[model samples]
Target: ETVPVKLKPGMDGPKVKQWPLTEEKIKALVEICTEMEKEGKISKIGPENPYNTPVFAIKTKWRKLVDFRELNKRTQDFWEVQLGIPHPAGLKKNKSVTVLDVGDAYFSVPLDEDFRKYTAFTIPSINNETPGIRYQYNVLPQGWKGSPAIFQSSMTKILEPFRKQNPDIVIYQYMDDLYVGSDLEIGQHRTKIEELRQHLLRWGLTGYELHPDKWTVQPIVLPEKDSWTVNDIQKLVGKLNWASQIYPGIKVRQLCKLLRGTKALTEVIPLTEEAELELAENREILKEPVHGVYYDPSKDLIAEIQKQGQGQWTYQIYQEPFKNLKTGKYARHTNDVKQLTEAVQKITTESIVIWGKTPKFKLPIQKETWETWWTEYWQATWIPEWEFVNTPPLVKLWYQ
Candidate 1:
């Protein structure tokens, strides 16, 4: 119950200077600002304390931010706090979702001693037996933008009376991640996690704690290295781009030619029999578990424009079924493609689009026989074409 952050009536907080602390990052920024000044969160403010700023530190030792973009451009803009957020699709029909974690989450909230001297900060100095200093933030500090709307309205008022006596427990909070679903029984989900860890230790949240290797519940895979580099193909392109974005799956231009033409992300790359068969079909698509959004509009939209299979030029789209020769059935299985004139319906994707001569080859069917048996294998549709990008069909530039 402590977060005031007002500032903006007269304006006062911008005397920066702490961007390069370097003697190997000032001994881990003086060991994380002397453990946030022995846990008082942060202190010692001077230069006649006139609200100064600057402290961005993230090479990670706990991202202690503090360059509140000119003190949140002079603070004051707490988005009319009706703060509510908790939907991992409601833990997709709950049966245990857990999450909980609060350790140093915005330094366990606190700050209102006149808004902690308007959130002062600074740390530059590694010379002459360690010199520079100035600090301020007794809790509630981390690049402040109303610090997650004051720690999500103080965790929705400490779980509104534990949601009026556990209405079958569901409680979610986004800021310091608290999730908790429960379709009951797993020992009443460990007795509702020791009754939400004593309702967050009766609202003090002494770093609540829920370790399962710090919340991954599962799915970390990606290491059997037969070879890799360009920082392991940018770590398998950020794990198939976050598993094609949390199962909304469909992108994999052979996972973009597995870093087709890259170098030194520590350099090493080289595996392309079509990137070892698209990394075993993208490792059987993340070891089979894509039930939500791999959408399927029945078939027939086979795009790719040039070298349609004498193979070389890339851009592609694919799908394949369409018989209905008066009753053969298989037109979107039986109806609903509707595009009689211009019903594109939808597809806005703009997430990953590096696209600029990504050609070092991706194989759409470099013919090996082709009695034209649909050129052997098709699939493409990694989608992203955008706004009727059509025109490449002179029937594949008339076979080049």
Candidate 2:
């Protein structure tokens, strides 16, 4: 049976909806939807080749981590606003427009939750019980089931200082990538980023670091790495404003890898023998009880979160699924969770092996081995079949 888990509270309704495709942009969006709909295997699940493509292409593809099902645009808009980017096809942009023909590719959720959540078990427990019980649930801590919604809400608060400081600047969010796209040139873009960065820094929220090299003008090309040049931005297409480009499937997918969330197990794994022993000791604690509940707070909580926060982490396990560990015994999850980390490390690091290409292709491209029949659907049925308007209302979001 289906239960609405309501992973978290959403705006009044679904963040995306089914409105009639009436605007030119909306019509274009529908065409993209139709192209992506038929691509089953490659689009959502595995063979993650497409997500690795370079940022210079005219179009990029993405494999959405989850289906949006049906949420209102306002909720999606909330996400864009937090990212400091615009929502070109959102509610405010076309108040009269209620249709959402966009496919899953435009979505912005993290790809490594399972790996990181397992790592969180590495934190050490001090009382022979789960350590740091408060933070156990957060793995990557940054991304989670309700992450997109939480991020959207957090971004609003995060960007509020910028909003108040720079009244003229329009802010938006599209997941974590922030944009300052406008008619302005590179220097102006740089200034805007510096201002925003400082605003965030002042609030003591430092983890969301900015890649100075990625800022650009409309139709700008993102720099591949450090020591890039203006020539890089020159050859690339720039968005008239980063927000305007939000819903373009190809463009959105092309830019997906910019932040590079897949981290190496080597980078964060705890290596000290003591650390290793700490892990072993903590694992044993699962059998010990502290408070009448038989909880081992030290090993179960602290060390588990610490190890995971580091790397190659796992935790103790309980014998039964629902059984309570007392002065009863429990097995730490660190070992099994470490297996997950190793698996992801292999998959994400050996991209060439898993996806079969260097600088991988974006997820959308591999959706299916589309034959000429698929071309007809986009050229005839999806595009020409729909009526559209120009200059649809620019979808809007407000950062706190």
Candidate 3:
């Protein structure tokens, strides 16, 4: 059984044509076609059909794909929207992710019977006598118009039910690759995987298989070194971008700033002494484990400002890192340095430690001065403004 494709009003596909290729290549092409035919994936077509397109083999590859240029032009609007790529921000230290690719993605979906004739094409036989015999696809084939959109739409519909059922599991689909993420522990994670496997099998989704090589459980971490070559720099920047999502406000942002003006792979510029020192300092920061703070707006309330025109703005402030209701986990209510310094003054008996790194004092006259100095110090530690301009966009909830 073959699927059909619908054409636009008054639009017709190109006439059948043959492409030039070597004898060996032709034999390879025929062998592939014969295998597909045996699998009931394609069939020969007649000359009387109005639609025909050319076929060509990639110069270095054994497989053949249709040109479909004219067919694609007519079907451009159908493929406008594509699947979204998964962001790494949702990944936490304890989370696990499994990546799956749709093997033989195109052939897994059949073309509509009405539209299959439009995909008809011809290739020169190994003997070169009969050059224009036509073959049409029974299933969706590569190089066809709107093929990706068709596959993605179908897959999305198939996966939608699974998404609804498993609200806690984060499922992200990018065309054929499906990424399933969870923060569940190893035992429960295995159970989740089994549940997902059952749904996949029940849905009749063929060729959806795991990409074991890309499977990852740990959060992205920064490495120690890089080369000064342009290609190396570009690759490093890409990795840094990926790492930034997992380790926000870290040293990756700083290192990216240091290597700003690279032009080519061959371009060589070694780091200066000052640059070397900055890189070394950032390496130590990356070595530290990422820590989190818990905040309850009611209990931690230190300051609240409501403007007449703007809206109600609530700020829960803290002066120093304290025990975050758990061992080795210190908490600070806000990232604002000004608020932290003010909170430090309200406590008369104790000296505060900020993230186990800096000390704070609560004294009558010195508090404001202490706040000013620490505010300046924190500003100095921030990633420089120059680095922000050239960096890639970050994932955000709202548009700018």
Q: Write the per-residue lDDT of candidate 2 for residues 1-400, one digit (tens) a residue.
A: 1111222245343222112112332334334434543642112222221111100001134211212222212233433333223243222221121111112211322323332222111112334353211111211122122333444554677677777876644453323233332333546645666666676655443211222223121111222343323332222223212322322222322222221455442343222243234323433432233223333322221101012222332222222221223111112333433343333222222221111111111111112332111231121001101111121122110000
Question: How well does model 3 score by local distance difference test?
Answer: 0.47
Clash count for each candidate, listed in order shown: 1, 80, 10
Q: Tens digit of lDDT per residue, candidate 3, span 301-382?
A: 2221111122211111233232111111112334344443333332210111111111222222243454234422231111
The residue-by-residue lDDT of candidate 1 on 1-400, one tens digit each, is 5644565567666665545445554556667888779988888877778667756444323344444656654663452223223233444356565655553456766777877877777677756465567778787765465665667766667778877888776665433345576676667777767776787787666322222211211232455677676776666666666555444443567656656553567766676776666666666655454444221323223333233232133233323211100000011111121211011111101001101101111223323222122111211111112222333344233222
Models ranked on TM-score: 3, 2, 1
* Model 3 bad stretches (over 4 Å): 1-32, 38-40, 48-70, 81-110, 127-129, 142-157, 168-198, 207-400
lDDT of 1: 0.48
Q: Report every candidate's CA lDDT.
A: 0.48, 0.27, 0.47
Highest-scoring model, TM-score: 3
Ranking by lDDT: 1, 3, 2
Which candidate has the top score in lDDT?
A: 1
Better of 2 and 3 by lDDT: 3
